[PDB]
Symmetry: C2
Subunit: 121 residues, 2 copies
């Protein structure tokens, strides 16, 4: 009996996020900016990746859903909304000591690596 | 700078629990019945371990805290309260297909392996 099931990544990301914050660490998220649908300031991307501070003080309206991470943040003082499909989330760790986790591959994220509509009808 | 931090186990256990239940799987918890402070029906322990069904229908007043798992459950029709220190939680998986996780060792649980007071003052 083959059972269909959702990716584990969002649950692991929220687990480590909560653990990091409960221990007063500053949660840093490593993102694959080459993943389709990623919407971040390209000028801050290095080697195809971008590291984001997901602390409560560095983000606004933080959402860690099963399909994506979304929030407002300031870059050089300018507030902008970032949108990150879950497949682009590579790891999350504490800025203070690097403790965290690198998410294991999940084939579903290859299938979901598709460019969404960002323009209105 | 050495940073003190709490064990990750309870966060991982809750992550997998939620993932299992959100995917309609029946969560089974593997417990080390030899760990001090464990309070379970010894008659159901096999090779020093006991497997418990943590589904919403099989448990009552389920608590998955940072230090322990506690709930009421029926064995041969009799309701009894179980208490499981987090250090005794070995793994959690889906009864249906065995998907889940075996918790990694955390030295803190060796230090916490101490017999608590179960009798009143
Ligand atoms: Ca905030
Ligand atoms: Ca948006
Ligand atoms: Ca129940
Ligand atoms: Ca009790």
């Amino acid at each position: 009996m083959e059972y269909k099931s959702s990716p584990k990544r969002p649950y692991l990301l929220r687990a480590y996020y909560d653990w990091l914050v409960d221990n007063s660490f500053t949660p840093y998220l490593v993102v694959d900016a080459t993943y389709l649908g990623v919407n971040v300031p390209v000028e801050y991307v290095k080697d195809g990746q971008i590291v984001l501070n997901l602390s409560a003080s560095a983000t606004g309206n933080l959402q860690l859903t099963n399909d994506f991470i979304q929030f407002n943040a300031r870059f050089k003082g300018v507030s902008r909304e970032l949108y990150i499909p879950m497949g682009a989330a590579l790891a999350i760790y504490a800025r203070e000591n690097g403790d965290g986790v690198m998410f294991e591959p999940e084939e579903i994220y290859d299938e979901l690596n598709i460019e969404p509509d960002t323009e209105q009808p």
